[PDB]
């Protein structure tokens, strides 16, 4: 089954993503095909998939920016029926907003079936245009039709995935303890991570003994990413990935506080130095504590 | 010996504190007697005492606000010599800024002797006026003269004192681990702690599942106290006390993140709820992790 998480949903036939037009929270805002930039935040094109209990392979899809739900208009089974953003809730019984999401016949892309209508999310005519209609359409689970096939490009990690990435890092002290704060995290491109750092005001902060030293920089950077999360997204039920670590050098006579993020493939952590905005595979310390 | 730490220095004869006039960083700013309010930050009346290596019971005294040092003018041994704020460094060899500080004959108050002149810090005539002259004056270590006797009212804790306060709290989980970030901390009155909370903007923050929940509130409050430290004080070599704790309820099926501060007597911790600005002796959780 598709994991709970945040997805960038990309048509299998043409490089168009599922896009809530202008990110509007208005009821009945069109959901359309739109081009995208890899290794960015695609602000209108992120979807939180929430599994429904006691309904196999069935989800709500909440737009991360608008906090509104992918909705088949009046649940109609007519081919060409509008797919829109609409107000709802994560565990609604409204079948207009319930979507069965299972692998296509190519074993990699998915099809997205409305739970009520049993019709499929369809990029009409495979139109690659920006603002191309997406509709509910007749189809089958097994057919090759790329209009109705969608890559779910996973943008989030579970706490368990983050814990795995840390555990397979070689720069962890024997005495390490990790403290998990949330359940599901949006992984930032370094470009975005860096922009939050710049916007924090840390780049202009002076290192001062105890009163604003490494621990103040690291905790300030985490607070700044936390604030950016709440201020940026209207959806709930996830966090933004930004770690704090305390580390000790090899000689065991110097400690340091710093941040860490995750690679694009979600497999490994990268250390961030909030003094100078550097990314390092080796920051010259072994982490004895992390919270994230 | 007097501990390294931050002190509010209060005359034994009249309720006047040692005050750097208008907190000015200007060289030659008068240091004067001035009245004070207990359980506040007395902005111009806090002094960081830094022990000198290989000189017994001898210190620099740095004004926490100005970052300038208590200085006997031209190191003169003449009675009535000005005591001023002056630019210097924590481990200076300038005897104008070096002060031997040992218990008076009453065993509770101290006398403050210039290391160069061997004359004593004197509230001239015991004048209780706001802006009364403080000078270097002839005297002895043993005499009762209250003009030259000074209570060192300790405003800071060592990391060891903070660790003791946590350890004698009854709301600590069996699995607790504590992570120490700095060495010496200014303890805030609750009135000040509360004001930093209000000024953070947290009072108007909405609790949102994962994206701005208890851990975001607690880390935001710590960052806010860290920022207030750096922005408020020009001295270095200390931090502001504000803790983060993670806790678990008695049933072991609910966790919470929150802050903690220290009592006026520095002996115990008090829990702070950054959701609503409440202080609690029991927040209904046992702490399994803290960083401070
Ligand atoms: C190029 C075209 O592809 C397929 O048609 C699609 C449509 O496919 C879907 O709807 C049709 C009925 O209209 C049928 O139910 C099919 O099984 C289902 O996948 C649909 O995707 C529309 C809207 O984008 O575009 C095309 O018309 C195929 O059936 C056609 O023969 C033809 O090869
Ligand atoms: C009331 C007064 O108290 C004492 O005199 C102090 C001064 O005391 C100090 O200086 C004197 C010499 O002027 C002497 O060296 C003494 O041992 C030393 O403590 C001084 O504090 C000034 C400035 O505030 O005020 C008083 O004059 C005492 O010696 C006097 O006899 C008298 O009791
Ligand atoms: C918030 C906004 O984001 C961008 O504009 C969006 C646009 O974003 C996508 O398409 C553009 C080209 O139009 C790029 O490929 C981006 O990488 C995509 O994410 C669409 O989502 C449309 C339709 O909803 O809305 C626009 O606001 C960007 O161009 C803006 O400057 C701005 O940052
Ligand atoms: C059958 C119908 O179901 C609900 O109305 C849906 C509507 O539902 C959502 O939005 C409305 C406000 O328009 C309410 O907030 C619901 O709580 C939401 O779930 C949308 O799905 C639209 C667009 O497809 O269709 C309506 O039929 C319900 O509110 C109605 O009373 C009625 O039961
Ligand atoms: C920063 C400033 O602090 C207060 O004024 C100081 C003053 O503070 C002390 O004396 C006042 C009465 O004048 C109260 O007792 C305070 O509790 C004391 O801390 C002195 O330090 C003088 C001399 O240096 O400077 C003033 O600025 C306060 O009254 C101001 O509103 C302001 O907050
Ligand atoms: C003997 C004298 O000592 C120093 O001058 C002090 C002076 O020292 C401090 O302030 C000056 C600037 O005025 C420098 O930054 C020093 O580094 C500071 O330690 C003050 O103590 C004043 C007031 O009592 O007295 C001067 O004598 C030194 O700079 C001189 O060259 C000279 O060696
Ligand atoms: Ca949480
Ligand atoms: Ca610090
Ligand atoms: Ca530190
Ligand atoms: Ca959180
Ligand atoms: Na399910
Ligand atoms: Na010493």
Numbering used by the authors:
A (entry chain AAA), B (entry chain AAA): 2 to 293
Paper text:
To explore the significance of the structure-functional swap, we generated and tested the activity and thermal stability of both single- and double-site MOA variants targeting positions 208 and 276. The single-site substitution of Trp208 or Gln276 to either Ala (W208A, Q276A) or its papain counterpart (W208Q, Q276W) led to a partial loss of the enzymatic activity and decreased thermal stability. The side chains of both residues are relatively poorly defined by electron density and exhibit higher B-factors than in the MOA wild-type structure. The catalytic cysteine (Cys215) can be modeled in two different conformations, oriented approximately 90° apart. The formation of an arsenocysteine has previously been reported for other thiol-based enzymes (DeMel et al., 2004, Winger et al., 2008), and is a consequence of the reaction of cysteine with cacodylate, which was used as buffering agent in the crystallization conditions. However, simply substituting both Trp208 and Gln276 for their papain counterparts in variant W208Q/Q276W was insufficient to preserve enzyme activity.
As additional feature, the MOA dimer carries two binuclear metal-binding clusters, symmetrically placed at the dimerization interface (Grahn et al., 2009). MOA requires the presence of calcium or manganese (II) to switch from the inactive form to an active protease (Cordara et al., 2011, Wohlschlager et al., 2011).
